[PDB]
Structure 1
């Protein structure tokens, strides 16, 4: 990327390196911030940097911006059970908010690592099929077993053409 102020924030690595995963009960995040004043530096930098990372990890969570409606920047979270979480940011920096958000509503490290651990067992190594879903495609790709007749031609005694010839004779 050439255009833009910070082209690095528009690459797949930057979108994927942000680790903030909301719980299944989080649906709506509303961010209000001001375009003037030194107090809103943390809020504006949070919108300019971290929000793309947050949305990429939570595709199903609505994120809506509102500019210059409240003198004090804040973040509002709407849960599934109607619960409202209000986060107040007036001097916290860009980094602080992400750490604060990750603790009130983010998922725990043990929960994330066990979630993908249970995902691994779906692609069981012992199965056969297409390359996109299974490792091997046939039993001939295992050393020791009878190889595919395409690569190594089979002995005549095992070919069905020879088997039928002797039965009819």
Structure 2
């Protein structure tokens, strides 16, 4: 996409590939940063680059920014318990902030893989139905079985027409 300063961050791929997934305790994340100062720098790049990634993977978490309130950059996390995590980001890099947040309330790669494992056992291989939900529709299409007569017309005997015309006479 042409317009913008760093167009690659408007791409579905870029948004996908960010990895942070909050624990379910996290409701609100609040960023407070400054528009000036060298120290503030990292926080700014965080809002510019990762906040989009983060949000995309945690669509239910309110993220909110505030500019030039406090003399120093920070994050605040509001949890469901009422607990409040306060993360001072000062001379920290963009990357360091993402890593430190992933450490505090993330989800271990174990957790994420278990979850996706529970989602992949949802569509069972041996079922039958619409292409959307299943690998096969009729059993007309499994190798050894009897084929869909819309392909290979049946032997006259298996036809109900023939059976009926037999019982009649």
TM-score (norm 2): 0.99
| Per-residue deviation, 1:39 | 0.3
Deviations 1:98-124 (A, max 9, x none): 000000000000000011011111100
The corresponding residue for 2:145 is 145
Deviations 1:70-119 (A, max 9, x none): 00100000000000000001100000000000000000000000110111
Which consecutive aligned stretches of 4+ in structure 1 deviate over 4 angstroms post-superposition? Answer: none
Deviations 1:4-23 (A, max 9, x none): 00000100000000010000
Deviations 1:57-78 (A, max 9, x none): 0000000000000001000000
Give, in whole Å, the separation in 2 of the partners of 1:51 and 1:153: 60
Give, in whole Å, the separation in 2 of the partners of 1:122 and 1:79: 30
Give, in whole Å, the separation in 1 of the partners of 2:28 and 2:126: 42
Q: Which runs of 5+ in 2 are unaligned?
A: none
Secondary structure of residue in 2 paired with 1:122: coil
Secondary structure of residue in 1 paired with 2:151: coil
| CA RMSD, 1 decimal | 0.4
